[PDB]
Design a protein around this nucleic acid. Structure first.
Lengths: 9, 182, 122, 154, 49, 193, 186, 90
RNA sequence: AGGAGUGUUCCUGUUUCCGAGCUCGGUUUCUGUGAUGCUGGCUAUCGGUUCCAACCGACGUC
RNA sequence: CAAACUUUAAAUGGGUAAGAUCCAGUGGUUACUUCAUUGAACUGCUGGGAUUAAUAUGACUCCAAGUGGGCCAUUUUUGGUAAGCAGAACUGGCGAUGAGGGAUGCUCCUAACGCUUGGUUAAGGUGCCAAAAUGCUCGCUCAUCAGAUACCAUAAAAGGUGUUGGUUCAUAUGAACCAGCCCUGAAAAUGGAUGGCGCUGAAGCGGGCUACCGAUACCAGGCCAUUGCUACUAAUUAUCACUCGACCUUUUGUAGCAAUGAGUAGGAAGACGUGGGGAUUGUGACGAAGCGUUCGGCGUAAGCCUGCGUGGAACAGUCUCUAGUGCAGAUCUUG
């Protein structure tokens, strides 16, 4: 988890 | 054509500044000082340094009017000089009185910075020559001056090492040289 | 053409320690090693290629003769070098027969076009 | 170290010498219209509404006037950027700035100077002149001859 | 295995590499002004429509 | 010629009185850069960019205010400056004179071969010929700022007989270099051409 | 050996050429860079740049917005370096005279029926080389899904940025941060 | 661009820039030489000075004295101050 | 500086001397922007690929 | 006398302001404010003003890498007997960086690097090694361990009737004090270091004065690349005096002008090469692929082309699509 992305799922 | 190599490039300069006018204090009192230096510029530098010790004045608060060059009157003939000076040793300050002999005051002060550095290791920065008066032969108090005085003085040339003009010089010669000469 | 010809280098740029080891071939590779002397540019070592060494725009790909080579396969492909004969010298290819050389070489002389290979296969 | 609202204040927030006791009444009768410069000096005598220590001695623009306070916009470097920060503060801790007052005088004379030409064709080009080089005159008075000084120990 | 606690070295040099000043704007922003005051600026603006 | 002769007659006349003629202080100076790029504090680095002294052995004509003096205090030991003369100004603009030409962004630096380059750019202000620059710099006219910033800063070669010692001032009796020489920069710069 | 910033040699940020391999768009630019260089009018210089833009700046203007920019100025040719879409909400389409890169086939039917000319950019050159009595327009650039997300980053005090979230409704980013009852509002 | 041509030296390329330069060259050249049109103005202005040199040369030596007197008096006055401090303290 | 050409008609320079009030106009020869000019050796040198000598240089990764 | 005292109080630094986002005059809006068209803020109109100190100068949004062990130097400075020790402040370097000097040295000095022809210097030097002075000119020094160039590769207290000057007293001589060079103080283990040889009318120590030598720095010029600016269609741009001749552009380009050019981690751009697919142009039993080679050539380079020999059956150019696509290293794997 880095940067502004969607939290992965 | 006149040989540059013998002398240092000292020239004597008079300087005159005056502080600076103000609304409190108009028409100030004027100054004057004889100095020795390389140049017309470097005299003014030395003027403001010395005047800073005497009186509450600076280069910013001051104004300079004239830088007159002075020379000898008659530079043809030989004369005695009693130089007064001070310098700064690694301990402290000492006043001296040296006596030098040359055709000019410029020639004396060139000869003195050589002499003073050579003996006392006094740097150019520390020395400040206070006044350079002309002296009569029956006045110099130093023994190395007195031997020279008197007419009919003679000096034999002893051990004649000639500085050959370049091109004259050769690495090998035949004969082996002759130094007593005669 | 034939203008003056100035080269900057005549030496190649051989690969660092191509001399030492036979596994390292002479084809240039930039040394990317952190401690390497060649990339760090000490004196008395292999020179690197810069764009600095680039030859003139007028005289790039120019032969010793004066021409630019334009290499050629069939009899049909020499006709292309008809109006550019002064400018271009034709190199007959690697692969070509003894028969088809002597058709090319003979057709070239009809066209007044120089052929580089000559006495190519006899 | 230690961080508190008033850490290292000591000398900074000291009232002064022989300056103790509360604010005078004439300093408390100053008016501050919004769009006006003010230097934030905090006096420790009043502990109500005193600004943080960093803002002490900072000039800035009045944006608000609360009943018993003055909103001042000051500006503050944070590494890469200035940022305009909005700090309310009690009336006693604000001074009137005097930084603008040459410019405020200047415009009244300067705008009136350009105005009054009209038909003479203005083009005055009104401008301050920085005092550079002086021109020359003759000067004469009483003199003194100085020389350099011999050393004395004392 | 310490190690250095803190440093300001190369921070002024980093900041000055890019110290941006906010662009000036006409008409002052009203965030943090009095609610009583800003009520009467709405009632003011309504009355001239 | 006439103002040179008229300068003498003043300070002869005042000398005949009793007093001394305080001369007019010099309105233009001529800076030259002496120490190079590396190892410079960030305030001295700024000032040298404001004088357009961006590399070694670069001249620039620069005006005398109180402001422009107090800049030069900060830079002194990277700089040798002083007062030009009509010989050295003529020699700079004829021999080494280039001129900057274009919009903000790119100016081109063009050689002064004809007056028509000077004419189109400075024909607002008078200043049609190359010789009218030399007046405007030497006198310091009303349009000095325009005429100076027209000239791309001068690119002088290294002085024929060398420097003495770029550590030390031109003052001091080690005969160094940095600092201001009131007139003697003229003797330097005539070798750097 | 110069004290120069970047020793520039400083580049220009904007696009310097056409990126499309679309041959019609290339020939459009060759026209309008002959016409920009030679004619002197600033209209053609701007149209040249806007032709080279990427897709998100060539954004579609509706027929109903194109009415209301062109409302007082009915006579003038309505230029748009961009596409033109039909507005379905618009009942009676105003006639106009539009130029644009591309009309959708509804908007071409709706203008042409309503008594209303529908030009290409090469036709606009023949009528109006200078751009004399034209109206440049462009659709709003910052009006799309993607540009809602940009700015101050959603969990910072007084931003209006959308978060990147997989799904809508409660159970997704509505608790700690968004309520005062869950830790903090921000 | 073939070459950028020289000012000061050359001649055709010079006299485009400063068109007065042709005549000021002939002024200084002919005023040296014994072509007598301009050489008369030089020798007249030299002798007009040279008489005025002999005019003030009385006052020139008076400036040399005005210096040397003033510092020789200070030279004398300073040494008498050194004499008094030896006497008064002892 | 170099594949030809014609030639100064315009242009700047230097120059013949005629008139107008140091400055401008008209006129004749000469030279530039429009200059490469004369001459010799070799038809093997020049040049190139290889190996060798000499003077100076030259002691992957965390 | 005071880091945890202060009446007073510097330098160097820090804030704000220096007009077109301005100034004044006059009317309106308002639940605010006033005792009150009194104010306040915002607005309409009407004047006044174009850069109102110096100098220089064109000035958001998105996406993402690497990095989060640092070390050194001058000045400031805390712990410590001190440390090539530990911890800070400001700036500059090294790291990421060569070139010339300091004999030799990551950090000192000069000075920052495209390929080069000529000229000039910097720091630093000129007896020989070693390019340039056994140059010129004036002092001091004799060492039975002389001395010899910043950082730097150690020296002190205390002495000297060794010598060279100075300061100040006392009768020619006699004291006292000061500071130059030299000597004493000055002891370590392989054989050894002003870098060496050596040097004493220096080739030593402290000064002068000319010229010279000395960088990839500075200056003018030629070529290569980058960035920026110009100019290119009633398409015969054709060389900026004018005809013929030869090169010359495919604006996803050419031609012209100017300035610029170091680089690890990292980012981006254009090329070179390999195995297959599609399209197209071809080579080959009169000899394809591969291999070898001082026959060679072209390109800055990756690489490409080609003579001769061997070889004996298939291969290549161009535009596109695709990937099990480039090796010196892994105590790599197999031989």
């Amino acid at each position: 988890v880095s940067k502004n992305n969607v939290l992965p799922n | 054509k006149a040989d540059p190599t013998l002398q240092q490039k000292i020239s004597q300069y008079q300087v005159v500044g005056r502080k600076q006018p103000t609304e409190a204090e108009p028409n100030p009192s004027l100054f004057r000082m004889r100095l020795f230096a390389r140049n017309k510029v470097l005299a003014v530098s030395k003027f403001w340094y010395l005047l800073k010790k005497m009186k509450k004045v600076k280069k910013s608060t001051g104004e300079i009017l004239a830088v007159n060059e002075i020379r000898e009157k008659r530079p043809t003939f030989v004369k005695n000089f009693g130089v007064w000076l001070r310098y700064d040793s690694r301990t402290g300050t000492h006043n001296m009185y040296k006596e030098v002999r040359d055709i000019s005051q410029n020639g004396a002060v060139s000869q003195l910075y050589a002499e003073m550095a050579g003996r006392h290791r006094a740097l150019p920065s520390n020395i400040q020559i206070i006044r350079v008066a002309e002296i009569k032969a029956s006045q110099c108090r130093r023994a190395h001056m007195q031997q020279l005085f008197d007419s009919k003085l003679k000096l034999p040339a002893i051990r004649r090492i000639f500085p050959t003009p370049k091109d004259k010089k050769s690495v090998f010669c035949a004969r082996k040289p002759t130094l007593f000469l005669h | 053409v034939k203008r003056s010809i100035v080269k900057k280098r005549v030496k190649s740029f051989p690969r660092f320690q191509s001399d030492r080891y036979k596994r390292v071939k002479s084809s240039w590779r930039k040394p990317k090693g952190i401690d390497c002397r060649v990339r760090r540019k000490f004196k008395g070592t292999n020179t690197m290629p810069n764009i600095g060494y680039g030859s003139n725009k007028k005289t790039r790909h120019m032969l010793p003769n004066g021409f630019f080579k334009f290499l050629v396969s069939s009899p049909k492909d020499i006709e292309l070098l008809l109006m550019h004969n002064t400018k271009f010298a034709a190199e007959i290819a690697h692969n070509i027969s003894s028969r088809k050389r002597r058709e090319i070489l003979e057709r070239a002389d009809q066209l007044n076009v120089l052929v580089l290979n000559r006495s190519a296969r006899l | 170290t230690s961080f508190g609202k008033r850490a290292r204040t000591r000398q900074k927030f000291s009232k002064g010498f022989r300056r103790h006791g509360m604010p005078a009444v004439s300093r408390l009768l100053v008016i501050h219209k919004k769009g006006d410069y003010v230097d934030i000096v905090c006096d420790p005598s009043v502990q109500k509404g005193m600004p943080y220590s960093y803002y002490h001695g900072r000039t800035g623009i009045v944006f608000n006037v609360t009943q018993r306070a003055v909103g001042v916009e000051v500006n503050k470097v944070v590494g890469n950027r200035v940022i305009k920060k909005r700090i309310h503060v009690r009336l006693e801790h604000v001074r009137k700035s005097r930084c603008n007052e040459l410019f405020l005088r200047r415009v009244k004379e300067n705008d009136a100077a350009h105005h009054e030409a009209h038909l003479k064709g203005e083009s005055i080009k009104t401008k301050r002149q920085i005092p550079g080089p002086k021109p020359g005159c003759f000067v004469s008075g009483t003199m003194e001859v100085l020389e350099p000084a011999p050393f004395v120990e004392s | 295995a310490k190690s250095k606690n803190h440093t300001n070295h190369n921070q002024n040099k980093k900041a000055h590499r890019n110290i941006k000043k906010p662009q000036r704007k006409r008409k002052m922003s009203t965030k943090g002004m009095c609610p009583k005051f800003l009520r009467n600026q709405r009632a003011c603006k309504r009355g001239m429509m | 010629r006439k103002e040179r002769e008229n300068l003498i007659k003043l300070k002869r006349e005042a000398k005949a009185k009793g007093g001394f003629y305080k001369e007019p202080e010099a309105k233009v100076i001529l800076a030259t850069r002496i120490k190079g790029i590396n190892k410079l504090a960030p305030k001295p680095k700024m000032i040298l960019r404001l004088f357009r002294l961006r590399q070694l052995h670069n001249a620039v004509f620069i005006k005398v205010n109180k402001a422009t003096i107090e800049m030069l205090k900060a830079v002194q030991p990277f700089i040798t400056y002083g007062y030009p003369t009509l010989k050295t100004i003529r020699q700079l603009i004829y021999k080494r004179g280039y001129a900057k030409v274009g919009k903000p962004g790119a100016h081109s630096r063009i050689r002064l071969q004809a007056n028509d380059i000077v004419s189109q750019h400075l024909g607002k202000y008078g200043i049609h010929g190359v010789e009218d620059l030399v007046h405007e710099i030497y006198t310091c006219g009303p349009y000095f700022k325009q005429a100076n910033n027209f000239l791309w800063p001068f690119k002088l070669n290294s002085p024929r007989k060398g420097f003495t010692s770029k550590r030390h001032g031109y003052n001091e009796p080690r005969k160094g270099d940095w600092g201001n020489r009131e007139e003697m920069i003229n003797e330097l710069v005539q070798r750097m051409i | 050996g110069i004290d120069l910033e970047r020793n520039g040699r400083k580049k220009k940020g904007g696009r310097r050429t056409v990126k499309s391999q679309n041959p019609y768009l290339r020939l459009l630019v060759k026209l309008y860079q002959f016409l920009a260089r030679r004619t002197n009018s600033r209209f053609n210089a701007v149209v040249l740049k806007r032709l080279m833009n990427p897709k998100r700046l060539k954004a579609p203007m509706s027929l109903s917005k194109l009415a209301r920019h062109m409302k007082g100025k009915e006579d003038h040719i309505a230029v748009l370096v961009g596409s033109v879409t039909d507005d379905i909400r618009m009942v009676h389409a105003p006639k106009l005279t539009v130029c644009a890169l591309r009309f959708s086939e509804t908007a071409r039917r709706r203008l042409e029926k309503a008594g209303g000319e529908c030009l290409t950019f090469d036709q606009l050159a023949l009528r109006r080389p200078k751009g004399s009595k034209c109206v440049l327009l462009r659709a709003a650039t910052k009006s799309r899904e993607a540009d809602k997300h940009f700015g101050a980053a959603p969990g910072t005090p007084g931003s209006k940025a959308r978060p990147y979230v997989r799904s809508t409704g409660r159970k997704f980013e509505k608790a700690r941060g968004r309520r005062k009852s869950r830790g903090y509002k921000n | 661009r073939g070459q950028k041509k020289n000012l000061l030296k050359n001649h055709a390329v010079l006299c485009r820039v400063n068109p007065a330069a042709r005549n000021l060259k002939i002024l200084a050249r002919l005023a040296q030489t014994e072509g007598t049109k301009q050489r008369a103005l030089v020798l007249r202005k030299k002798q007009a000075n040279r008489e005025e040199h002999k005019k003030h040369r009385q006052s020139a030596r008076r400036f040399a004295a005005e210096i040397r007197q003033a510092f020789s008096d200070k030279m004398a006055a300073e040494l008498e101050a050194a004499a008094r401090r030896k006497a008064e303290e002892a």
